[PDB]
Amino acid sequence: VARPNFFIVGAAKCGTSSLDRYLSQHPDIYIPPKKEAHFFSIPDFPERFTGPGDEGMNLYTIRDEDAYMRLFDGVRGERAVGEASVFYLFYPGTAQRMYDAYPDAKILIMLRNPVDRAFSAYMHLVRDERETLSFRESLAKEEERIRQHYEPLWYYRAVGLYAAQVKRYLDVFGREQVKVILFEEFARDPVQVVRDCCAFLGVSTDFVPDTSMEMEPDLREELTAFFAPDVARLEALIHRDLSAWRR
Ligand SMILES: [Mg+2]
Numbered sequence: 001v002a003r004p005n006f007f008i009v010g011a012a013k014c015g016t017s018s019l020d021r022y023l024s025q026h027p028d029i030y031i032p033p034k035k036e037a038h039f040f041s042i043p044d045f046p047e048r049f050t051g052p053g054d055e056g057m058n059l060y061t062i063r064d065e066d067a068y069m070r071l072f073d074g075v076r077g078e079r080a081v082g083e084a085s086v087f088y089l090f091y092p093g094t095a096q097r098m099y100d101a102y103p104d105a106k107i108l109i110m111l112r113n114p115v116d117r118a119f120s121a122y123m124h125l126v127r128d129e130r131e132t133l134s135f136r137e138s139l140a141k142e143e144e145r146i147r148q149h150y151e152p153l154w155y156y157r158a159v160g161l162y163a164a165q166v167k168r169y170l171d172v173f174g175r176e177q178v179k180v181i182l183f184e185e186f187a188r189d190p191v192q193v194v195r196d197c198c199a200f201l202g203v204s205t206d207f208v209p210d211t212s213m214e215m216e217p218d219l220r221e222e223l224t225a226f227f228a229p230d231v232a233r234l235e236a237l238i239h240r241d242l243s244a245w246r247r
Pocket residue numbers: 023024025026027028029030031
């Protein structure tokens with residue numbers, strides 16, 4: 001009976017889509033074509049997401065255990081089997097539900113400077129014709145959208161405060177079972193980062209994947225300051241320096 005032994009949990013707009021694509025190419029790794037099932041997050045969801053274009057998080061998510069298990073029907077011989085939903089990191093009860101099902105699971109987290117991540121989410125919403133406001137106006141609506149139960153793609157600030165989200169995974173799974181990757185390193189050398197993930201997942205590292213407009217300056221300064229205390233906490237949690245996020 002095929003089941004997942006690793007999860008790519010987020011964060012959203014951090015480049016996990018490419019990471020998933022590259023890992024899937026490995027002959028010893030299987031990731032189903034379904035993304036954003038969010039099975040382990042469902043109990044943390046509001047009754048329904050109310051924002052424009054939020055239908056997907058209501059409709060395309062998988063809430064039934066049997067349907068979730070069927071995602072893995074395509075596994076054949078792969079040692080590493082994984083599933084990717086980008087708000088797994090954000091919803092606070094997710095790690096514990098996963099652990100209760102799969103205590104030996106490994107967790108991949110990819111993080112990006114949360115200032116850039118926020119702008120990426122904004123650009124995504126604009127491209128999809130969900131948001132017509134300026135980024136400045138869109139930022140100002142976050143509190144009211146959280147109250148109104150919009151989906152988390154809209155929460156520019158909340159989704160970027162990584163420290164507590166990552167701590168929850170480290171607490172539940174332990175440092176042995178969690179690997180945190182920085183988007184900037186992945187962008188610079190995706191082959192190296194993918195090979196590092198192979199080592200983490202315990203599959204062969206002799207693999208080469210086939211890898212084939214501007215925020216207002218005052219907002220960049222203000223958002224950098226907003227996230228700064230959380231970033232400092234995160235540095236201590238993940239044992240590495242984040243100075244690249246302060247430039
Ligand atoms: Mg494969």
